[PDB]
Amino acid sequence: MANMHQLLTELVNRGGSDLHLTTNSPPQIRIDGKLLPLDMPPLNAVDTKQLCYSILTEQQKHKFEENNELDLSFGIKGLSRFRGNVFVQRGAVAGVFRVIPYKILSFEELGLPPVVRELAEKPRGLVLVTGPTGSGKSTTLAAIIDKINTDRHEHIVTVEDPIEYLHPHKSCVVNQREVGADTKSFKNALKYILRQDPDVVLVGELRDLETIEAALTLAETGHLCFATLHTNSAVQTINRIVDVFPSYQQPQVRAQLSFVLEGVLSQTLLPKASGTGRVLAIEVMVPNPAIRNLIREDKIHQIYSQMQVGQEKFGMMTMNQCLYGLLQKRHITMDVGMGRSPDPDELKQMLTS
Amino acid sequence: ANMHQLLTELVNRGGSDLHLTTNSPPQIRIDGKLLPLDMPPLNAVDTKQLCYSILTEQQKHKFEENNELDLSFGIKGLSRFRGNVFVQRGAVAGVFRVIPYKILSFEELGLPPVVRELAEKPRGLVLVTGPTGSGKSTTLAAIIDKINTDRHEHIVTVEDPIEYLHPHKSCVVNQREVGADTKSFKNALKYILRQDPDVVLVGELRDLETIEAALTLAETGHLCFATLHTNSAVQTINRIVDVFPSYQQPQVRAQLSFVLEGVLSQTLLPKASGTGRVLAIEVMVPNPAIRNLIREDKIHQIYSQMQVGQEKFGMMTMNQCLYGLLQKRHITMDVGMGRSPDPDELKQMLTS
Amino acid sequence: ANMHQLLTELVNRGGSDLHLTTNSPPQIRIDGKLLPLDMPPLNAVDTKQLCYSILTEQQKHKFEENNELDLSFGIKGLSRFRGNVFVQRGAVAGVFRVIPYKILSFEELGLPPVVRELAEKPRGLVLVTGPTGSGKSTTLAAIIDKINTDRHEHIVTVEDPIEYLHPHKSCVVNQREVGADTKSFKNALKYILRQDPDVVLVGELRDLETIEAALTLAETGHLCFATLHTNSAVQTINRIVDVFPSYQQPQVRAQLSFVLEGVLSQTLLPKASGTGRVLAIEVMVPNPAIRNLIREDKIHQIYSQMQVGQEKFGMMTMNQCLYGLLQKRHITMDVGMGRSPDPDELKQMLTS
Amino acid sequence: MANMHQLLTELVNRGGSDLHLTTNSPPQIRIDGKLLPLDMPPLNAVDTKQLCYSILTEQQKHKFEENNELDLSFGIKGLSRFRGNVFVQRGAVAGVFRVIPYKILSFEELGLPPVVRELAEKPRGLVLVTGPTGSGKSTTLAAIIDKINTDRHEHIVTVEDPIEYLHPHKSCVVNQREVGADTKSFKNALKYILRQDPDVVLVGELRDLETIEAALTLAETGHLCFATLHTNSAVQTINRIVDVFPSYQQPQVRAQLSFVLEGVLSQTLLPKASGTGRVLAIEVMVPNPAIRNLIREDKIHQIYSQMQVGQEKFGMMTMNQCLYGLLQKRHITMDVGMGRSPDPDELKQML
Amino acid sequence: ANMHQLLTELVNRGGSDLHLTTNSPPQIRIDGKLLPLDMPPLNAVDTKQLCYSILTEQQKHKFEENNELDLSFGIKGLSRFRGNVFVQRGAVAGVFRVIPYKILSFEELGLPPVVRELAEKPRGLVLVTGPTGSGKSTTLAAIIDKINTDRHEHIVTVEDPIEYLHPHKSCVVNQREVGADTKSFKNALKYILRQDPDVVLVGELRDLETIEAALTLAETGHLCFATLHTNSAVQTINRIVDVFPSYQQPQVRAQLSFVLEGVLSQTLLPKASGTGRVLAIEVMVPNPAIRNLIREDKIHQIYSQMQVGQEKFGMMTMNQCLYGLLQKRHITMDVGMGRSPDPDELKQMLT
Numbered sequence A: 001m002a003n004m005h006q007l008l009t010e011l012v013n014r015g016g017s018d019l020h021l022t023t024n025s026p027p028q029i030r031i032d033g034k035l036l037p038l039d040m041p042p043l044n045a046v047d048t049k050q051l052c053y054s055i056l057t058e059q060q061k062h063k064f065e066e067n068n069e070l071d072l073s074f075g076i077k078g079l080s081r082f083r084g085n086v087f088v089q090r091g092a093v094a095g096v097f098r099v100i101p102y103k104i105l106s107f108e109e110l111g112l113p114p115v116v117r118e119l120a121e122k123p124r125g126l127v128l129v130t131g132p133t134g135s136g137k138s139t140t141l142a143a144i145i146d147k148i149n150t151d152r153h154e155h156i157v158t159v160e161d162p163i164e165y166l167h168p169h170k171s172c173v174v175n176q177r178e179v180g181a182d183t184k185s186f187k188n189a190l191k192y193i194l195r196q197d198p199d200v201v202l203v204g205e206l207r208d209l210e211t212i213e214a215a216l217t218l219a220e221t222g223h224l225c226f227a228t229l230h231t232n233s234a235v236q237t238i239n240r241i242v243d244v245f246p247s248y249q250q251p252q253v254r255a256q257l258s259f260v261l262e263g264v265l266s267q268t269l270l271p272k273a274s275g276t277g278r279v280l281a282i283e284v285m286v287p288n289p290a291i292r293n294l295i296r297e298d299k300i301h302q303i304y305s306q307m308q309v310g311q312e313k314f315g316m317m318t319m320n321q322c323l324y325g326l327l328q329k330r331h332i333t334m335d336v337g338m339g340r341s342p343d344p345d346e347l348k349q350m351l352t353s
Numbered sequence B, C: 001a002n003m004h005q006l007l008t009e010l011v012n013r014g015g016s017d018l019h020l021t022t023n024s025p026p027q028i029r030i031d032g033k034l035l036p037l038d039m040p041p042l043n044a045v046d047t048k049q050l051c052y053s054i055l056t057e058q059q060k061h062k063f064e065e066n067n068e069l070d071l072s073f074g075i076k077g078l079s080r081f082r083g084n085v086f087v088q089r090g091a092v093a094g095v096f097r098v099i100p101y102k103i104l105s106f107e108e109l110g111l112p113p114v115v116r117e118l119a120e121k122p123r124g125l126v127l128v129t130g131p132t133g134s135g136k137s138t139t140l141a142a143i144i145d146k147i148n149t150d151r152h153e154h155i156v157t158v159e160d161p162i163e164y165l166h167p168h169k170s171c172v173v174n175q176r177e178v179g180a181d182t183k184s185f186k187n188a189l190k191y192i193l194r195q196d197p198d199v200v201l202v203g204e205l206r207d208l209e210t211i212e213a214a215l216t217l218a219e220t221g222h223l224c225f226a227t228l229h230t231n232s233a234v235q236t237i238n239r240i241v242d243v244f245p246s247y248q249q250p251q252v253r254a255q256l257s258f259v260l261e262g263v264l265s266q267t268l269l270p271k272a273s274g275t276g277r278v279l280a281i282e283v284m285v286p287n288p289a290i291r292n293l294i295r296e297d298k299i300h301q302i303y304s305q306m307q308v309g310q311e312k313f314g315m316m317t318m319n320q321c322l323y324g325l326l327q328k329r330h331i332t333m334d335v336g337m338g339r340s341p342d343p344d345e346l347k348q349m350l351t352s
Numbered sequence D: 001m002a003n004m005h006q007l008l009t010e011l012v013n014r015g016g017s018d019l020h021l022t023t024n025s026p027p028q029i030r031i032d033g034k035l036l037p038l039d040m041p042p043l044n045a046v047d048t049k050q051l052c053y054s055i056l057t058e059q060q061k062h063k064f065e066e067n068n069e070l071d072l073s074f075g076i077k078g079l080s081r082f083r084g085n086v087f088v089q090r091g092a093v094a095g096v097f098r099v100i101p102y103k104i105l106s107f108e109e110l111g112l113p114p115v116v117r118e119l120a121e122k123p124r125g126l127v128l129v130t131g132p133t134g135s136g137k138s139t140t141l142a143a144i145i146d147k148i149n150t151d152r153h154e155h156i157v158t159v160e161d162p163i164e165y166l167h168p169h170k171s172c173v174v175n176q177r178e179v180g181a182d183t184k185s186f187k188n189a190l191k192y193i194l195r196q197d198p199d200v201v202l203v204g205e206l207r208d209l210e211t212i213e214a215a216l217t218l219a220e221t222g223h224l225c226f227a228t229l230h231t232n233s234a235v236q237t238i239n240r241i242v243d244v245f246p247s248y249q250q251p252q253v254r255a256q257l258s259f260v261l262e263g264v265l266s267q268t269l270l271p272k273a274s275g276t277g278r279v280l281a282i283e284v285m286v287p288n289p290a291i292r293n294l295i296r297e298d299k300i301h302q303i304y305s306q307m308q309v310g311q312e313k314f315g316m317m318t319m320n321q322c323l324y325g326l327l328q329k330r331h332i333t334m335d336v337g338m339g340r341s342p343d344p345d346e347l348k349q350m351l
Numbered sequence E: 001a002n003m004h005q006l007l008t009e010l011v012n013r014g015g016s017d018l019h020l021t022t023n024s025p026p027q028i029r030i031d032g033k034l035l036p037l038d039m040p041p042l043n044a045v046d047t048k049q050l051c052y053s054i055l056t057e058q059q060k061h062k063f064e065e066n067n068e069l070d071l072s073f074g075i076k077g078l079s080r081f082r083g084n085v086f087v088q089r090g091a092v093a094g095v096f097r098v099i100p101y102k103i104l105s106f107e108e109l110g111l112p113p114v115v116r117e118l119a120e121k122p123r124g125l126v127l128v129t130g131p132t133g134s135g136k137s138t139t140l141a142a143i144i145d146k147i148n149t150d151r152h153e154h155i156v157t158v159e160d161p162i163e164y165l166h167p168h169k170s171c172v173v174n175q176r177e178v179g180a181d182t183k184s185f186k187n188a189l190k191y192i193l194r195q196d197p198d199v200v201l202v203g204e205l206r207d208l209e210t211i212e213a214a215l216t217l218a219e220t221g222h223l224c225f226a227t228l229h230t231n232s233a234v235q236t237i238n239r240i241v242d243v244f245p246s247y248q249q250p251q252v253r254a255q256l257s258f259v260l261e262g263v264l265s266q267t268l269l270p271k272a273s274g275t276g277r278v279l280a281i282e283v284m285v286p287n288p289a290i291r292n293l294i295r296e297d298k299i300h301q302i303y304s305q306m307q308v309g310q311e312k313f314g315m316m317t318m319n320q321c322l323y324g325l326l327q328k329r330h331i332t333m334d335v336g337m338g339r340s341p342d343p344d345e346l347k348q349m350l351t
């Protein structure tokens, strides 16, 4: 099965995020979100079965044959880490493999503004990095955590399902817990995380009420907490967070957020104007006293207006302001910027200004 | 095989359904009316062997476990079929429906242009609802054929059973049949997020767990397709919200207000010509006002927004659709009035 | 075997039910009233051996597991039977109901011509209601036999248990028994729409889910038959609407106003001769006015429309039927007045 | 083993309802509701244990020793039936035994008015006999069922927990199912009762919503259904029945009750002025069209006013009218009549 | 044989509580303050053997199962005691209270006459509430002693553990201790209705099941006593209703409106004399208006009815009781104002 080795090598070499193997199609690779077939014959059921089975242990093979489903992770030394999923479709084996890179890119390499660098220096509070799946959230978080590891002498604990970016010890002590192996669940890790003397905590996705309450507790007890959401803007993120709670407990949730919130980042990856790379578009909200009052008063919407005027002082930036800058530097096309702008008339006005 | 010849005769005679049951010969529905084939009447041995001849072992044990079975299967070079096997008077019986190999286009199916714009949506939840056999699977197959044609993305479907097949075009299309490819809807949804999908078809919203999985998919940056047996957009939204406990409904309403991108409610009416059947469809496309009504739990008043969203968003109430079908003489006046949820409004449209 | 002779005596004497229990001789219900047979009283050994003699081993173990058992069985050349076996005072007891092989005609049953016109309806909901043993299943079997004779369509029945048998005539007739052919009414209704039916018998309207299934069937182009234990058309309509939550009653009323094609409410009265029984039936056939009253929630006033739909539509109130039965001397004056829902109206009709 | 026989014989002979055996007290017998100690020495733990164990099987003995609780029923031939409960208190055995008589008294012997006799002739519907525990409800129901058994050629089925009064076949076929032995539960008996070709059904206590739905279904499908409640008046009974259902389903419950209700009896037993007998006080509501309308319109309370004026036409009688009659005949004392009257001002006005 | 001497010394010096724990000698609370006995400090062997010396084997295994145990026990010829055994720093510890053989009377306890009229009620639910050690069991024991004295009825109590003992007077009194006589509150309530009771004490309303059982008992013609840790009648009613799911609260409110006969809310205050304690008690006796407020879910406004029901029904808010105790110089001004739930109302009444 030296074909799996060559297929995964091409996946790495061409900068693909995911490799897809299924019957009646050639192997296909996702690059910056878009699928490309490899110049190979289409696979049959024999091909897909032999190829997917070639990277499994006997226990994992029997587990797949017992369930027609299998999640796993594996490494190719000197090449990359991978997340694998094996399943069955149309009576035949299919497989998907996701890249977990060895190298974390820097802030400047990722296109992140200096305000993110100042956020990596925050001593305590809740910082949220949000966006849709595969919008660069884990990569940005890994860059911030790598900066903390480099600059501070503190204890960083991450809880991940699964562990993606690895952070070997630099000046910090870094402990990384994988759900389903190192710890039973997010709930159990968060149940014991406060007794483990942390300073900085990564909690992963805000998957349930319990994890949300844990993040509010972390931000209230003197820690810097990182979490993700799949929301697309700062205002949408705050409303989503508040509205998951029963109406009687939303006052407390709003007060907690008004006290502890230190930053909201909402990312999305857009195709570059060149047609091959992708560029990060990011909305940055850094709370000032006015925004904290709007949070306490339940006037969430008006926060967007504060972001429109917080450019010079705090490095704040609405999504439309970022799309404007990406458009003037010719990094994205006009169609992509307009097609994704949350308010096209504002972007038009900025383009006329 | 005998089954091969029976299904070949079904195809050759332009029949819509083949019926196999004891003490009758095989019968075929032609133009709505049953006709017996010139064959001896079947006994229980005949019906059981014939129906079992097109089942897998897993499907056989499922039928023997439940005395019910829905399934689909193909005869290469001939056609696909949807089968239902059941038990009556202590003996096996079966019904078999034709599923053509060639999928019709949006314009051939009578679907308005807003459905074509829905096939281009990048993320969100799109619901196609209506009673059983109201064209829901056919509309979704047309939409999925459009995504497959136009996008370079990963489409995964979970079906019980797989009906329309979507061979790879520009997309990678994976189709999982419950009871063979995957253990259940729950298991497929348990692993679907780890499979790098972009567009997902989840089938019928059969339980609370599946609804929560679909909300998670639609919230995490994917375009999710699902079906319900509701008859209108408002009825669909109320049905979706009301299945949850009262304390968790606020979040469900917030999720729907955020992720909803379209609601289609279909029904099939006999055409005025006598040969076709025509799709009547209610289309709701959420605007900021509708999303607010959803958050405020003012669901009913959404129908009023649909009454005025014709020019701006391509929206259309069921009565507006029956009216358009009536002015073009596609349906009779009796069918349009007999099916209109508000006959006085349609009357007013005729006075206008 | 003794049981063969007991059931033969039950058939020969025109009894409806045979009762077997300890410390009493076998007893037969004739025209509603019990009669002991000229035999010694049974003991626990007698009742247990007799009831067990007509059970399979699986059924015996089920009875011993639950102290309850429903079943149906046939005696070739004699009759079908519905059996119930239970336990009382620590001993076995059993009841057995006659299911005749021959279905009587409309004219033999005393059913008016409007019922014959109802057997020709292409789609909709037709309800046959009344108390237990009021002739509902027999009327439904006559209607279904008429459809089987006249149409080339697919009839599916769901029964607990199967009572009247309908061998294929011009139709394909499939009959599913709950607890053997299908797990439940809910499961049969879950798959019945995927079985290409034209006419459906669903049995008793036992819960809301079955009601929604019947409304869906009647709205999707099918003719649906069901029973209720209500005693009048108005009482039936109110009962159907009032089982739903207040917020969904508007929809239920609109559905009923669209799909309802007939309501029959039966009761069996002793004949004046003392030997036969005569059917008294209230017939409601919806006209546009009644459909409007249904949509406007003015249900009671429907009785007034039935009072005047005699000449035009063949409609008939229960009191009008008792009046006709009284003038033809089919029933006594005491029975007609004693059963009339409004004795002053019947008096006025008698003075007219 | 020969002490229990004498104690139960004494229980029967003195007309007591229950015998109580517990440590540091002599045996005590409930007569007309009040406990009387027998002229015997007080029992110790050895006495109570041996005496209670004397009427148990080995299976029942080990079941009691496994759980410190035991319910059972048993018969003494030629004497009576009994319901027994054995339990443990203060580390010692205790026991209670309730009488189940072989003989059913007549309507006239029980003090029941003729309207009850006309209720035993009702061909269909729901008839409710209510009152507190031990207020004569099972005895009245047994008398009515014995009347149906005597007069009709129909099928009577009873579901009981446990079976109390026994109805041997007369002109009817009578089947009696005991919960826990003959049938698994009220739910199972009602799951199969409609397939057992009944005409008259006794369902016992209205334990839950499911049993209520079963009784309404039985009443609306052409059967005469008997049930009990522990309410104290017709109005209170109707309100309790309606109020147990969710608000959205109460319209249907009120419509069903308005259609099927044929009678409500609310009983209580009062000490006779003589000091030795007890007398039945009974409230009788028989629905007329006006009352059925009040039921449909949710105007339940005003039904009491109809009962005040339905005396001559239907044999109706409020509780206060019954107490007034009992007081005029000096069957009860003034203190008992006033102390149990639901409206003392009305009774004062009538007097 | 050391425990006997330690409890004897506890009794002789008039101490209220005995405390035994490791690394300290035995300590006795005298006039509220701890005094160590002139004995060597206990080790873990000492404390475990001493505490285990007054436990049954069942109670020992329950303690080893839970590291907690509440119980009561007697020393013949001496006294009863309430014990709590627990674990601290890996070692056994124990606390022991005196339970006197003589039950005080209503007048000796400071209970108003309405409580005496409550001891005569024929049926219903009577609640005596307040925090732990507010006199609830003592008040209940006084009421039960009054019923035992005055009635010829059957009293059954279920207790965890049994506190006051009620020897038979004119009633038959059976007392079941959870964990010895009966498996659980649930099992006792499973069989209590088959034991022919008239008056029942059910202990703490520990869960929803016990609440439903108490409501069934109260509606089936029995007088039911129970406790809660609420501090007022309004708070008690709201606490009882709000435990149930929203859909069942209508039925619970209807049941309470029908069966409730009294709500008693107690607390013990230091006497102005410095040596006695005085009972402060809020008394709610339902009238038709209060029952309507219960049915209509207007619970709060019930307090206003208590404010005006003093002359007619013997009703009394907590503030009115504190006002009376202050006028009689039974309590100090600081104690009354400090414990009053509404100091502004008490100030207006006083001044």
Ligand SMILES: Nc1ncnc2c1ncn2[C@@H]1O[C@H](COP(=O)(O)OP(=O)(O)NP(=O)(O)O)[C@@H](O)[C@H]1O
Binding pocket: A017, A099, A110, A111, A131, A132, A133, A134, A135, A136, A137, A138, A139, A140, A269, A278, A279, A280
């Ligand atoms: N600023 C960026 N510029 C270019 N590529 C990026 C950037 N950030 C992330 N990526 C790349 O694009 C892919 C995004 O993957 P990832 O960062 O893990 O998204 P994600 O939000 O964590 N998805 P998920 O955890 O499943 O919800 C990765 O393969 C990165 O290599």
Ligand SMILES: Nc1ncnc2c1ncn2[C@@H]1O[C@H](COP(=O)(O)OP(=O)(O)NP(=O)(O)O)[C@@H](O)[C@H]1O
Binding pocket: C016, C109, C110, C130, C131, C132, C133, C134, C135, C136, C137, C138, C139, C268, C277, C278, C279
């Ligand atoms: N019009 C009629 N005239 C005379 N006899 C009839 C008539 N209709 C039915 N019967 C007879 O009277 C009996 C009625 O039984 P059936 O028709 O099954 O009532 P049912 O409503 O179906 N009872 P159930 O299913 O238990 O609710 C049958 O034995 C028939 O033979």
Ligand SMILES: Nc1ncnc2c1ncn2[C@@H]1O[C@H](COP(=O)(O)OP(=O)(O)NP(=O)(O)O)[C@@H](O)[C@H]1O
Binding pocket: D017, D110, D111, D131, D132, D133, D134, D135, D136, D137, D138, D139, D140, D269, D278, D279, D280
């Ligand atoms: N009208 C009556 N007059 C005098 N005594 C009566 C009368 N009715 C019943 N009794 C007697 O008083 C006792 C009442 O017992 P019973 O009739 O079983 O009450 P109950 O309502 O059925 N109790 P329960 O089943 O536990 O809720 C019986 O022992 C009867 O003998």
Ligand SMILES: Nc1ncnc2c1ncn2[C@@H]1O[C@H](COP(=O)(O)OP(=O)(O)O)[C@@H](O)[C@H]1O
Binding pocket: B109, B110, B111, B131, B132, B133, B134, B135, B136, B137, B138, B139, B268, B277, B278, B279
């Ligand atoms: N717009 C349409 N116009 C005419 N016929 C249609 C249309 N859509 C579907 N059909 C056909 O009517 C039947 C509906 O079947 P189907 O779409 O599978 O219903 P279901 O919603 O239960 O999946 C099929 O035969 C289908 O080919």
Ligand SMILES: Nc1ncnc2c1ncn2[C@@H]1O[C@H](COP(=O)(O)OP(=O)(O)O)[C@@H](O)[C@H]1O
Binding pocket: E109, E110, E111, E131, E132, E133, E134, E135, E136, E137, E138, E139, E163, E268, E277, E278, E279
């Ligand atoms: N009215 C009262 N007046 C004075 N002392 C009382 C009064 N009631 C109880 N006590 C005493 O205070 C303590 C209360 O104990 P107890 O009644 O058992 O509290 P609980 O409510 O937790 O069961 C006991 O020592 C008791 O003797």
Ligand SMILES: [Mg+2]
Binding pocket: A137, A138
């Ligand atoms: Mg990630």
Ligand SMILES: [Mg+2]
Binding pocket: C136, C137
């Ligand atoms: Mg029938």
Ligand SMILES: [Mg+2]
Binding pocket: D137, D138
């Ligand atoms: Mg009874």
